Every structure is written in structure tokens, then in C-alpha cells.
Amino acid sequence: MFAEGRIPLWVVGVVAGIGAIGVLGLFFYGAYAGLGSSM
């Protein structure tokens, strides 16, 4: 992004960490909705 042919690794890391936090938050959301929510 600020280089030639290259992406900064911290941008890649923040994107991957945001995706990992998102799928963890989705898995925690599914504890309160749908199956296994006791309702």
C-alpha cells in the first residue's frame, strides 16, 4: 500500500485479527441464538 508490489504486514495482521475476532464473536452470538441457546 505504501510500497512497490507489497502490502504492509500490519494491515494483513489487523485484517486477519478482525476476522478472527468476528468469527469468535459470531460463535459467542450463537451461544445465545438458535441451537444450544436453551430457548
Binding site: F2, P8, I18
Partner: protein, 32 residues
């Protein structure tokens, strides 16, 4: 319902707001 839609849109704006600041200061040459 649209309340999770609005909740996730507000959440998306605030989660992007910080890395936007860091990314602008990296791109334009801020005193990071």
C-alpha cells in the same frame, strides 16, 4: 429486525475508525 443491522453498522464504523487513523498517519507520513 433492523436493530442488529444498525448495531453492526455502528460497530463496523467504530472498528474501522481507529485503523483509519493509524492508516492515514502511516500513509501520509504522520509522527507515529
Amino acid at each position: 429486525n433492523l436493530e442488529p443491522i444498525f448495531q453492526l453498522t455502528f460497530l463496523g464504523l467504530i472498528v474501522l475508525a481507529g485503523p483509519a487513523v493509524v492508516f492515514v498517519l502511516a500513509f501520509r507520513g504522520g509522527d507515529l
